[PDB]
Each structure stands twice: as C-alpha cells, then as structure tokens.
C-alpha cells in the first residue's frame, strides 16, 4: 500500500477503473469534449499501470485527491472554458479540492439527450461498442455530477446488457425500448432519491435523519441488537453527510469501509447478506443497501411491557431521552416491516409527546397507560387510503385510474398548470400500478418509496413557480406529515372557473393516428381543461360527457373522411355538453 492508485487499480480492474475515471472527470469538467476526456483516462490509466509495476515510481506515492486535482489543473483551456474554477489551481492540497467541489455546477445547461432510433443505436453499438457506451456514459455523467460514480456504472451495464439482448432479436425495437424506458425511469428515481435524502439531511438536521435511519435499518435487520443498530446509524449518517458533500473519493472510501464492516459482523447483523458480501469491492455496498428484510426472531415480547406498562419509563426516558426514543423505534420497526418509515416516526413522535406530558404529572403511569391506543388512528389512516385506492385501481385500469386522479386533484388545486397536473396524474397512476401488485404486507412501504420522490419533485417545482399557499404549507411542513398534508387538501371552493375557449376543446383527425401515449396525453389535457372550466361538475356529468366524447372519435376515426365529422360532430358535442352541464 505504498501506492493508492496501484491498489485501487488492482482492486477495481482496468475495465472498471477506466470507466470510473471517465465518469469522475466528466462530473467536474462537464463542458469539455469527449475526445478530450478520453485522452485523460488514457493518461491516468497508463500512469496507474506504472505504479502497479513499481509502487516506488515517481508520484505513485501521492494521494488520489492530489493526483486527481493535479490532472484537472493541467487542462490547457480550463480558465477560458471554466474561468473561476481555474483559480482553484492556485490553492494547496486540501483547499484546492474543496474549491473544485464548490464550482461543481449541479444541473448544467446541456441539451436534452434525444434518444436516437433503435436501428441507428444498434448499428453504432456494433461498429464500435466501446466508444458507443463510453460516449453515452460521458453524456449522462456530465448531466448528473452528484450521481454516485459506482452506481452510475451499475446502470451503464444494464444498458450494455440490453443492447446485447435486443440488437439480435427479430423485433429489436420491441425488445430494446421497454427496457430503455424501465432504465430511464429507474435512473431518474435513483437520482431523485439521492437528492431527496441529501435535502432532508440539510433541511431537517441529523436528529431527524438519525430517527429515519433507525426505523429503516431496524426493519431491515430485525435480529441485530440495538447497540449494533446505533453503531450503524452513526456510520451511515457520516457517510451520507460526506457523499452529499459531493466528494467522490471521500464518499467511496467511507462506503467501502462500512460495507467491509457490515460484512465482517455478518452473523451479528443479518442472514440475508451472504450474497452481497461475496460480490467484489465495487458492488458490495450497493448490494447491501438494496438487501431484503431479514425475518424477525418471532420470539419478541410486547412493546407494552417495556414502554407502556413497566414503571421507570420516565426514569429511563429522562436519563437519555433520544436513546430511549431510539430504542422505541428500533423495537417497533423490527416488529413492523409492513409499516412505512414515516408511519413509524409518526408513532415515535406521538410517544415522545405523551412521555413529555405524563412524566411531569402526579401519576405518570396512569397518564400514558392508554398510549398504544392513540396509535390505532395513525396506522389505519395510510392503510385505508391504500386499500380504497388499490381497489379502485383494480376496477378501472391504469389509464382510467390516472383519469380519476386527474379529476380529483385538478379540483383541489385548479391553479396548477395543466401539463403538470397531467404529469402528476400519470406518475401517481404508475405508483398504483407498481405497488398494488403487492400483498397488503408490502404495500405501505412501496407507496412511501414512490410517493416520496413524487411529492418532492412536486415541491421543488412549486418552489420555482409558487401557485398555492396550501401546497407551500405541505411542502414546507414537516417531512413526516408532508403526505398527510396533501391528503388533507380540499376542493377549492374559492376557485373561479376558467372562461370557455372553443379552441381548447377543438379536436382534429390527427387524434386518430397519435400513439396510445399521445392519444392519452390529449384526452387527458382536455379532461383537465374541462374540470377547470366547470369545477362544480359531477362525477356523473363528467362521466356522461366523457362517454359522448368517447364514441365521438370512434364514429369519426372509423368514419369515411375525418376532418369533417370531426368539426361537424364536434360542435354538436361541445354544444350538447355546454348544456348538459349548463
Ligand atoms: C447509462 C450508460 C450508457 C448510456 C446508454 C446508451 C443509450 C443512451 C441513449 C440516449 C437517450 C437516453 C434515454 O432517453 O434513454
Ligand atoms: C443510537 C441512538 C439513536 C437515537 C436517534 C433518535 C431518535 C429519536 C426519535 C424521535 C421521534 C421523532 C422523529 C422526528 C422526525 C423529524 C421530523 O419531524 O421531520
Ligand atoms: C491520477 C489519479 C486519478 C484519480 C482516479 C480516480 C479514482 C477513481 C475512484 C474510484 C472509487 C472507488 C470505488 C470503490 C467502491 C466503493 C463502494 O463499494 O461504494
Ligand atoms: C437503509 C438501507 C440499508 C443501508 C445499508 C448500508 C449500505 C451502504 C449504502 C451507503 C449509502
Ligand atoms: C398504494 C398506491 C396508491 C396509488 C397512488 C395514489 C395516491 C393516493 C394514495 C395515497 C395514500 C398512500 C399512503 C402512503 C403511506 C406512506 C405514509 O405513511 O406516509
Ligand atoms: C406548477 C408548479 C408546480 C406545483 C404543482 C402542484 C400540484 C398539486 C397537485 C396535488 C397532487 C398531490 C397528491 C399527492 C397524494 C396525496 C395522497 C392522498 O390523496 O391521500
Ligand atoms: C361547458 C364546457 C363544455 C365543453 C365540452 C367539450 C367536450 C369535450 C371534453 C373533453 C373530455 C375528454 C375526455 C377524456 C376521457 C377519455 C375517455 C376514454 O378514452 O375512455
């Protein structure tokens, strides 16, 4: 270990090394050419090979941070392409690195990546598969500077493993795309999740974050002892803090250590880690973070024993509140892998509130005795919402479900952009699709995972373009009662119907050719606009109107000559509805 580069190069391998060096140099230097970055990776790769041969060879001793920042500072243009950033090069050892991290422009101003055509992609991917994948890795990398390099490399393998399995099929497009979409979705969810966690950290402090991590890791490792859990919650919190900070090398080291640790005390944490701990250094932490819940001892007492019945609760509580409450989450969480973390945190905050009222009364034990009773309501609240919503999603398909939501929310916050109201109705509908397929045991957790990112995106958007104070209240409210805040939104009885506009409800024959996913966008955009014009409409007046419009295009799409029955039968419907809705 005389050489850091040689060790990582040897641990990682030439292939993964060249890839990670690329992703790393593309996250900083996100305005440089591909050919330019490729010249670096080759320089740095030949260098690391030198150190592998002779660990005492010039510079091989230097640390990765020094070697890395040293290479950056050699970029000829740097100053004219980046300016301010080039001033970092005047600083020393630790400041220099911190300087670069500061100028790491999150969300750059690069053109959307337009997905080529299945036939061109598949041809590019054969005529030179390496520079094809590397050229795209580079593309995605520069667009997501805070995306964890190793994980960004994990997707770039499923992408490669898709072009492999599809560009050889009869119907390549039928193969490729649906996976290229599952991936796009996945990578987008992953990125949103990471940004989400780094915000909760900053916005709500580590206390809140720790409370989250406890509940989460307790469900995951129900066999582990609270002391172990605490140990992990601590390491875990220090890892996130610095990965959030953006330092890849620092963050990478911290994650490797923690994985190495967890893998060591494997039998002390959980039985479902065998597989993950067999994998290489690169995919170990990632594997573990995704691991499945272990089975709970089954020989677990009652929470009421140590937390509601027994006396000295106030005694054990006052001694170290946070640790006592942390003991409650851990106890409750590992017994309920079927609950959502926020639901668990909601029970802990409630417990915390009672304890803070009873422990100060004449007869404490008599005050908090009925506590577990106050939990019932909080538990059934998300439970009922999930049942009623999945049952409905089963009657009407996804699309007709997405429509149901559309009407519901547009009526709550009519002030919202239609295109955005549609986007959210489609995303929420997917959540019902992905999640309702699960048994009642894994539903609430699923819902939380998905709704969380959606509700956040919703909020970051609203941040930029404020629309309703009510949405702001929920968005700025506590991260634990954020969703319930949205669930409590009410029909906007103050909204003033948007004046009619023929053009808005004017349909053409093109609606006949538009893809299913386009035919829907328009039927849906019209549905929103319709609810925005007559908000007091009923689920029956709307059902009727939607029905007329249904057969409307059927007897106009299948009709000899469209552009006519579309403008003829059209006025009829607009005029007919205008009245049947008055
Ligand atoms: C991720 C790592 C490799 C990139 C995958 C190659 C296909 C990218 C095609 C560009 C369009 C992106 C998309 O919308 O899916
Ligand atoms: C190791 C000890 C770990 C102790 C962690 C402390 C846990 C305290 C739990 C208190 C429950 C209230 C949770 C607060 C959620 C924050 C929020 O409202 O956003
Ligand atoms: C000249 C020096 C150039 C610097 C090269 C950059 C080094 C790449 C960093 C590799 C990160 C190691 C990833 C380890 C995987 C850890 C984990 O399990 O999460
Ligand atoms: C909660 C998810 C389980 C965490 C396992 C730790 C793996 C390290 C991931 C680092 C972020
Ligand atoms: C379950 C899937 C439901 C489809 C999504 C439709 C949106 C309305 C349903 C919201 C209720 C879900 C409750 C989330 C549980 C997480 C929490 O306790 O905060
Ligand atoms: C245009 C600027 C962005 C602002 C967007 C605001 C959109 C508001 C729509 C409200 C949809 C939130 C539903 C979340 C699920 C609530 C759960 C439930 O109904 O039980
Ligand atoms: C008072 C204003 C009257 C306006 C009359 C316009 C009538 C057209 C409304 C558009 C509604 C779109 C229906 C979308 C439902 C799609 C149903 C389906 O395809 O199964």
């Amino acid at each position: 270990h005389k050489s850091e580069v040689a060790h990582r190069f040897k641990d990682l391998g030439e292939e993964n090394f060249k890839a990670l060096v690329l992703i790393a140099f593309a996250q900083y230097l996100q305005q440089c050419p591909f050919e330019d970055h490729v010249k670096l990776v080759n320089e740095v790769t030949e260098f690391a090979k030198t150190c592998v041969a002779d660990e005492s060879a010039e510079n091989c001793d230097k640390s990765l941070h020094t070697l890395f920042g040293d290479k950056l500072c050699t970029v000829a243009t740097l100053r004219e392409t980046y300016g301010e950033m080039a001033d970092c090069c005047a600083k020393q050892e630790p400041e220099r690195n911190e300087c670069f991290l500061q100028h790491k422009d999150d969300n750059p101003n690069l053109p959307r990546l337009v997905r080529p055509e299945v036939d061109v992609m598949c041809t590019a991917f054969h005529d030179n598969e390496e520079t094809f994948l590397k050229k795209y890795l580079y593309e995605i990398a520069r667009r997501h500077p805070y995306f964890y390099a190793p994980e960004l490399l994990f997707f770039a393998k499923r992408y490669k493993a898709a072009f492999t399995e599809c560009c050889q099929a009869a119907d390549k497009a039928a193969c490729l795309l649906p996976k290229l979409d599952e991936l796009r979705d996945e990578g987008k969810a992953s990125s949103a999740k990471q940004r989400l966690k780094c915000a909760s950290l900053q916005k709500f402090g580590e206390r809140a974050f720790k409370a989250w991590a406890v509940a989460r890791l307790s469900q995951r490792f129900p066999k582990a002892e609270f002391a172990e859990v605490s140990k992990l919650v601590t390491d875990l919190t220090k890892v996130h803090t610095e990965c959030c900070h953006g330092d890849l090398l620092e963050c990478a080291d911290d994650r490797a250590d923690l994985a190495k640790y967890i893998c060591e005390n494997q039998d002390s944490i959980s039985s479902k880690l065998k597989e993950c701990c067999e994998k290489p250094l690169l995919e170990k932490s990632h594997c573990i973070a995704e691991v499945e819940n272990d089975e709970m001892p089954a020989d677990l007492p009652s929470l009421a024993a140590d937390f509601v019945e027994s006396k000295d609760v106030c005694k054990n509580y006052a001694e170290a509140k946070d640790v006592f409450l942390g003991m409650f989450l851990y106890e409750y969480a590992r017994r309920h892998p079927d609950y959502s973390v926020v639901l668990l945190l909601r029970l802990a905050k409630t417990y915390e509130t009672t304890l803070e009222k009873c422990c100060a009364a004449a007869d404490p034990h008599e005050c908090y005795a009925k506590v577990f009773d106050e939990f019932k309501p909080l538990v059934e609240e998300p439970q009922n919402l999930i049942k009623q919503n999945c049952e409905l999603f089963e009657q009407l398909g996804e699309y007709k479900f997405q429509n149901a939501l559309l009407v519901r929310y547009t009526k709550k916050v009519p002030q919202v952009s239609t295109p955005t109201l549609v986007e959210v109705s489609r995303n929420l509908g997917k959540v019902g699709s992905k999640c309702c397929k699960h048994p009642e045991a894994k539903r609430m957790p699923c819902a939380e995972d998905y709704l969380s990112v959606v509700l956040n995106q919703l909020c970051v958007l609203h941040e930029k373009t404020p629309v309703s104070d009510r949405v702001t209240k929920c968005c700025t409210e506590s991260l634990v009662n954020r969703r319930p805040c949205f669930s409590a939104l009410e029909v906007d009885e103050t909204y003033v119907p948007k004046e009619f506009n023929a053009e808005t409800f004017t349909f053409h024959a093109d609606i006949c050719t538009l893809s299913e996913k386009e035919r829907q966008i328009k039927k849906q955009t019209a549905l929103v606009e319709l609810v925005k014009h007559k908000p007091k409409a009923t689920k029956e007046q709307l059902k009727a109107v939607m029905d007329d419009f249904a057969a409307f295009v059927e007897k106009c799409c299948k009709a000899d000559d469209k552009e006519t029955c579309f403008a003829e039968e059209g006025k009829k419907l607009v005029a007919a509805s205008q009245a049947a809705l008055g």
Side-chain angles (χ1 to χ4, degrees), residues 219-224 226-237 239-243:
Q219 294 180 312
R220 207 72 133 232
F221 313 138
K223 260 99 136 272
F226 179 88
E228 202 63 51
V229 172
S230 313
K231 198 240 127 85
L232 303 154
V233 166
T234 296
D235 285 350
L236 218 221
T237 302
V239 179
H240 276 255
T241 296
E242 82 183 48
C243 289

Side-chain angles (χ1 to χ4, degrees), residues 467-472 474-487:
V467 163
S468 177
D469 52 305
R470 277 141 77 242
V471 171
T472 305
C474 302
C475 285
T476 59
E477 201 98 291
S478 160
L479 215 94
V480 32
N481 40 353
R482 165 177 270 197
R483 197 277 296 143
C485 182
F486 276 115
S487 302

